[PDB]
Structures are given as C-alpha cells and as structure tokens.
Amino acid sequence: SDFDLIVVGSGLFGLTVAERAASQLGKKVLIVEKRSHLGGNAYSEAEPETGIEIHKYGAHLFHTSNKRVWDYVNQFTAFTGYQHRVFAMHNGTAYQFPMGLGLINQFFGRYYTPDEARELIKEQSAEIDSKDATNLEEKAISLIGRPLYEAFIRDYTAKQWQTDPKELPAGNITRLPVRYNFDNRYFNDTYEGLPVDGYAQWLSNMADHENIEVRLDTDWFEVREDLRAQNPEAPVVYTGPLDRYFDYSEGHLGWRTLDFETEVLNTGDFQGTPVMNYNDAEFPYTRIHEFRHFHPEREDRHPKDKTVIMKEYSRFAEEGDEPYYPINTPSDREMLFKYRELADAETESGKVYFGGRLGTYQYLDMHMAIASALSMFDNKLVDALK
C-alpha cells in the first residue's frame, strides 16, 4: 500500500512514532499536519528583519536525564553547550535565581553561609507548618517565609494562573524551592542544550526518511474517511485534541493559553541575558525573552544594533486561542476519565491510538513526549503493525 501507518500531527510525539515505524519496522508512514509547518509548538523560525531564531509558540529549552532519549535525539541534531540561567526582576533589581545564596544575599542585605542560610529559612518559615497549610499561599509561606513569598512568588503566580494564590491547591508546591549554595543552573538534568542549527532543522530531519510522507495544511477530520478507505487496516496514531475527536460529547476540556508580544528593538542588547522574570504585579507580562542570547555562538551572524524580544502573557484559553496547558479542575479531570474510556474503545474498534499533549490532555516536555512515543512504539505499535 501507499502507507502502512497514519500519524496525525507532527509534534515531537508524532515525529518520534513516525520515524521509529519508518526506520525500525521499514513501514510507510503518512504524517497529516494541520499547520503550515512540521514540529508542533517546538518549531522555530528566523525573524525576518534580523535573522535571529525565534519561537511563536513559546521558548523551548531542551533538557533530560533520560539517556535513551538523549542518544535518540542526537541522531537528528547536534546540541550546543547552552545552559539555561534565569534572573528575577523585583522592585527595580535583577536577582540571581532560583532562590539560593545569591538571591538570599541580595534580598536580605548581606552574605549568608550555607549553614546560616538554612537557619534563616527555618526562622522565616516557622510561622506555618506545611502539614497545616490549606492553599498555595500558606504552603509557600510554610516553606520559605512571607518576605520571600511576597517578593518572588505571589504576583508571578497570580499572573500565570489569573487567580489569587489563596485559592490554589496546597498541592501545587511539593518541595523546598531554595538552594543552599551559589549554583544558579536553572535545570538539574544530566543533558542539556539547544539544536545547533535550530529546532526547524532538527524536526525536519526527523521526518526526512524515504519511508515518510508529510502532508501539511491538512486537517485529519477533513481527510480521514478518504485516507482510511485507501488502506482500512492501517492504524492511526492521533495526537490532536482528545475532546474534539469525540465531538465534545462529554464537554470542553479547559486550557491555559499564552499571548506573545514580539518586538524588534534598535539596540544590540536589551537585557543582557536570555530570560528575565518580572515578579511584580505592576508588569502585566510574566517574563521577557531576548532570543539572541540563546545562541551566543551565532554572534557574528546576529546584527550589532538590533535585537528581538518577546513579552509573555498568561490567560485562560478561549475559542481561537492556542491551547497550551491543561487547567485540570476536578471538572476537567471528570470529563477526561470519560474521554479515556471513549478513546480505549476507539482503539479496540478502530485501531486509533491516542498520544501526545493534546491527545491525552497532559502537559509534556519534549523529552517526555519522546519517551512516551518510544513507549507507545515499543509496547503497542510493533504488534499492531505486523
């Protein structure tokens, strides 16, 4: 046949499943993608005026401690030695971040040794016991104290969730967000970096295989009856929205979205670092990204006098908005279990598998999407394609 497997969506989940079927099982794979490009939200592109690589669906930082995943992705791209570091703007000062000896010195006014900082945090947080906390605000204060909570956590959290922290689950904070050393590496994973030639080239390489066909600007729901009629026995891996697949018969799952305000400025350097969080309520955005600093190795291809920045705004996703993060209210959880039983039935009756962020109503980092795809391949698709 012209194809042995259909994959709906070309995000990292779809690309991984397609590439494994193509290269490991020698199967013909048809990828159906609604957007004008491959890669899902990880896709990046050159900004036209400056040539700087930017993102339109969020900045993407790759990091993992999963060696299988790391070895896998390096078949398709090399990675730079980039290490993510973040700074936090509070009350006119840029603080070292996350909370550690650096921030503690800057905020409390003098140097605390590791042991002295441990003592300070015990003092500050003595007010509430974490076992007695009823919401996010209290759970935070129970761990780091009111001054730190009110300076670096309260307004930022309020902006991201569009909700007062007193109205959020104590379960949203599960560990001490304080380091007792000067290490400000943002991620803790064994492997980390950015694709040397950008995300678009990486993701394009994954789909570049003699056995893989890609159809862009194609909505599954508009072509599915025709495609499956060509080869009824070919399974489908669906990574589109779960609720939309079943015609919202159990209601609309709720998502957070993001607005991005992207500007080209007439300076070579706006903030001197890739990411500046804005922790104060007076700034409506949560953080500013300055894209050139994600690739300092590209400096003599970047303009000397221009730079691209992007401000990030958080809100509830309405009709038309890109769905990014599951909200997960108990109402949401409710209709999800209902959709899971529909999906499981659809797999057994129709050979349609559900995966990915949209297909399963679950936020997935890139390495987690890859791991999840590798697992579906190993445990389900190898059998279904014999």
Ligand X SMILES: CC(=O)N[C@H]1[C@@H](OP(=O)(O)OP(=O)(O)OC[C@H]2O[C@@H](n3ccc(=O)[nH]c3=O)[C@H](O)[C@@H]2O)O[C@H](CO)[C@@H](O)[C@@H]1O
Residue 160 binds which one of ligand X, Na ion, ligand FAD, none, with CB within 5 to 8 A depending on kind? ligand X
Residue 102 binds which one of Na ion, ligand FAD, a second copy, none, with CB within 5 to 8 A depending on kind? a second copy
Task: State the Cα torsion 24-26-27-30 to the nearest 10°.
Answer: 80
Single out the segment in contact with ligand X by CB under 6 A; choices: 13-21, 151-159, 350-358, 373-381: 151-159
CB of 203 to ligand FAD, least distance (A): 9
Any catalytic annotation for residue 333?
no
310 binds ligand FAD (CB under 6 A): no
Given the DSSP bridges, would you call strands 352-354 and 236-238 parallel, antiparallel or unpaired?
A: parallel
- The token pair that represents 308 in the structure block: 């691209």
Residue closer to ligand X, measured from CB, 124 or 160: 160
Q: Give CA–CA dist 278/259, Å, rounded.
A: 15
106 binds ligand X (CB under 6 A): no
Q: Give CA–CA dist 70/191, Å, rounded.
A: 7
Q: Give CA–CA dist 126/141, Å, rounded.
A: 9
| 10: nearest Cα among 28, 34, 26, 45 | 34
Any catalytic annotation for residue 179?
yes
Residue 93 binds which one of a second copy, ligand X, ligand FAD, none, with CB within 5 to 8 A depending on kind? a second copy
Residue 279 binds which one of ligand X, Na ion, a second copy, none, with CB within 5 to 8 A depending on kind? ligand X
Q: Give CA–CA dist 193/302, Å, rounded.
A: 20
- Look up tokens 């862009």; give the residue: 216
Any catalytic annotation for residue 43?
no
| 56 three-state secondary structure | coil
State the binding string over 154-193 for ligand X (x if CB under 6 A, else -): --xx--x---------------------------------
Omega of the bond leading into 98 within 30 degrees of 0 (cis):
yes
Count H helices and E strands in the chain, helices first.
14, 16
Residue closer to ligand X, measured from CB, 3 or 191: 191
Any catalytic annotation for residue 340?
no
Q: Give CA–CA dist 241/248, Å, rounded.
A: 10
Q: What are the residue numbers of the active site?
A: 175, 179, 256, 287, 312, 363, 365
Site residues for a second copy per CB under 8 A: 81, 83, 85, 87, 89, 92-94, 96, 100-102, 105-106, 109-111, 113-115, 180-183, 267-273, 293, 296
Which residue ranges make up the site for ligand FAD (CB under 6 A)? 8-14, 32-35, 40-42, 57-58, 60-62, 219-221, 239-240, 258, 324, 356-358, 364-367, 369
